[PDB]
Amino acid sequence: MACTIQKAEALDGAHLMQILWYDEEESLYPAVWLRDNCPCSDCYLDSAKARKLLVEALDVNIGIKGLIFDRKKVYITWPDEHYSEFQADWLKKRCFSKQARAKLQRELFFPECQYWGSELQLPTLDFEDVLRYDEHAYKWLSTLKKVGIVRLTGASDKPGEVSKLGKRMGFLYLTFYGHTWQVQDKIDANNVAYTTGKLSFHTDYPALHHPPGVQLLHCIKQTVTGGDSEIVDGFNVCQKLKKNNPQAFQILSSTFVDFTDIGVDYCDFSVQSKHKIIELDDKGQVVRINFNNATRDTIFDVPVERVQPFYAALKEFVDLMNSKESKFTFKMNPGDVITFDNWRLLHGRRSYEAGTEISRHLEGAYADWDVVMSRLRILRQRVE
Amino acid sequence: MACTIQKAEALDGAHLMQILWYDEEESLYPAVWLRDNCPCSDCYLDSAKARKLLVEALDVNIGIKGLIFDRKKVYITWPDEHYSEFQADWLKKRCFSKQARAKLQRELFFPECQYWGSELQLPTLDFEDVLRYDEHAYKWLSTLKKVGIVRLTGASDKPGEVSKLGKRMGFLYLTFYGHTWQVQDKIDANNVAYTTGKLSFHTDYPALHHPPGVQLLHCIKQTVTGGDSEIVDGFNVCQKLKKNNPQAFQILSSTFVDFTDIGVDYCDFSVQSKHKIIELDDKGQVVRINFNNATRDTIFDVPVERVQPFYAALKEFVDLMNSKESKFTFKMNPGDVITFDNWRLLHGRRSYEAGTEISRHLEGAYADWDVVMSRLRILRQRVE
Ligand SMILES: O=C(O)CNC(=O)C(=O)O
Ligand SMILES: O=C(O)CNC(=O)C(=O)O
Ligand SMILES: NCCCCCCN
Ligand SMILES: NCCCCCCN
Ligand SMILES: [Zn+2]
Ligand SMILES: [Zn+2]
Ligand SMILES: [Zn+2]
Ligand SMILES: [Zn+2]
Ligand SMILES: [Zn+2]
Ligand SMILES: [Zn+2]
Ligand SMILES: [Zn+2]
Ligand SMILES: [Zn+2]
Secondary structure, three states, rough: OOOOEEEEEEEEEOOOOEEEEOOEEEEEHHHHHHHHHHOOOOOEEEOOOOOOOOOOOOOOOOOOOOOEEEEEEEEEEEEOEEEEEEEHHHHHHOOHHHHHHHHHHHHHHOOOOOOOOOOOOOOEHHHHHHHHHHHHHHHHHHHHHHHOEEEEOOOOOOOOOOHHHHHHHOOOOOOOOOEEEHHHHHOOOOOOOOOOOOEEEOOOOOOOOOOOEEEEEEEEOOOOOOOOOEEEEEEHHHHHEEEEEEHHHHHHHOEEEEEEEEEEEOOOOEEEHHHOOOEEEOOOOHHHOOOOOOOOOOOOOOOOOHHHHHHHHHHHHHHHHOOOOOEEEEEEOOOEEEEEEEEOOEEEOOOOOOOOOOEEEEEEEOOOOHHHHHHHHHHHHOOO | OOOEEEEEEEOOOEEEEEEOOOOOOOEEEHHHHHOOOOOOOOOOOOOOOEEEHHHHOOOOOOOOOOEEEOEEEEEOOOOOOOOOEHHHHHHOOOOOOHHHHHHOOOOOOOOOOOOOOOOOOOOOEEHHHHHHHHHHHHHHHHHHHOOEEEEEEEEOOOOHHHHHHHHHHOOOEEEEEEOOEEOOOOOOOOOEEEEOOOOOEEEEOOOOOOOOOOEEEEEEOOOOOOEEEEEEEEHHHHHHHHOHHHHHHHHOOOOEEEEEEEEEEEEHHHEEEEEEEEEEEEOOOOOEEEEOOOOOOOOOOOOHHHHHHHHHHHHHHHHHOOOOOOOOOEOOOOOEEEEEEEEOOOEEEOOOOOOOOOOOEEEEEEEEEHHHHHHHHHHHHHHH
């Protein structure tokens, strides 16, 4: 009933088509949008699933010249004699009602989000199962999107495991630190990560204007002397901050902070960026956290009177992240891989002891959320 | 005189340091920022040029306990007995005055912009000179940033030339269409680009949330039957649109448009994004154009009443781009490479004739603006 056409007619100076569906619901489609979306071979390249029609070809004041229909299709003539056919199901999916549009957006972008604190049950799957089975790889990526982290257990204790996951996704995101990179204590370290020091909560790579969306970290060697992992749900923390201290939230979501990274690794680099630490979308919703205290520049591009209040806000934010209700701590063992949303979570590590041999070694890499989401869309379709 | 210290003192409850320079100018530095930016080996990892100090270690209400100075350095004791030394030049550069901050930002981000229309003199350099000489590679990247395009002449007529430029920059930006890609007419084309059809003005890859910043296109084979290139300065066009039709500008800078790309190339993909066609920063300035009419989805996530006005605005924008005062047309010959700002310019191509052999072939690739800007910073330093 819902996608079967009972009546189709041109209305409002013929600038709209109305469909009455067999469940008595009505849908409205502007003529200009129909013309723009003609699926004929002149207008639309089927092999590419892409529009050939130019904006220049589109009369924005167009009206429908004629229309006939049956239960499954509408057939339209245009004023310049162009002819179009539209399928009922295709029309129904693209209905302009708020409910229909929102449903479709949920299907495209997987917005469901489960916020968490110290009660987190770390989602865990088997590494080889994820590589082998679409059902498991679907569970991996959909959980990564919804919860912001998944642990994979049973990988090897050798390099090359994150690269396998990269291929399973599609491809990894190359940066100045390489295609993959080795977290271990290094002489003349070019990054605080490559020491035995504590890493407080941070996101990776705010020195880029487009920080990595997803991070992969594979434990190859672990030390008994420290090196525990800690994570927090940045979106959950930002919610608490807005409630508890709206001025601090306002400062952190409005102040551009400069980040920097200069050195040599995969290539020689001199990188500079500006970000708001709490990055909001046009509707006021937090979409990314951009914060690494190590790479925050000494350069701070604000008037003198805004400085101390910024630090005071930052301190409140960090104190909230460190709260026993917010953080989750765990320790990686050799063969574990964590995969997480680097736009949402902040992560850290406990200090550990230096010595003469390497006592601790992670291999890491990055991926782009668009690459990950593409694989997720494909997997859903394959498993359903 | 300007970077020599005449007096340094703690002021305002010791929460500020004031420097009187020998030119009688004064600079103010908040105590909290000084403490945060202590360069000692406890606070700062010199090998990484990065901050070790944690936010947790920072007293946001800190004041200076004691201060002495000479002409070139300040020496500070803190309330908890921590001790810091700051160099005059380092302080002077980071002065919080609006003039000093703006000067420094210009140095980091190369904001100078030369808008253009049909009068454009296409900046042109030799390909091999750019690969060989830093002076020439500096001119290439600084012109690319300022004007939005540079032609390089004298490349080979063989694949692999854009890859050389990629290495000269640092690395290319991998996408689903490959590390590099071949623009030619293809059977069962997965993209309108890979046909002989006309491409109206577009930016590449708005189906990604982070479209490529810089595009490289190398002419390997060119046809006499068409295939001319066209470009327009999107920032210039957006300025004209705001002046001529503020409602159209408001619509295009506020409406989220869905983009899509589904197919198989380097990998199998199903990509979806949303962008505002005219993307403004927090100050109202245009920072990116996101528009490809081929990959604009049939899905359009707006209420029905906003549809026709959107198309009417889009048409006005396109008509402005097509204006004889706005566009610049030229034709690539084998051995030419164009490199351009894909966030600012829109580009297109004239249709040409299909036949049995390949009559036209470009090799293209992408790079990230942060990668390009890093190389530009490095080059400036090397050449100066
Ligand atoms: O070493 C760890 O456990 C965590 N490492 C990082 O967060 C990093 O390198 O950015
Ligand atoms: O073929 C040309 O001249 C231009 N090509 C493109 O703009 C493209 O492939 O996106
Ligand atoms: N079932 C209606 C088919 C209409 C075809 C018209 C072709 N111009
Ligand atoms: N020139 C002044 C040097 C001060 C050194 C103090 C060390 N604690
Ligand atoms: Zn149906
Ligand atoms: Zn058509
Ligand atoms: Zn990290
Ligand atoms: Zn290199
Ligand atoms: Zn000096
Ligand atoms: Zn110190
Ligand atoms: Zn293009
Ligand atoms: Zn693949």
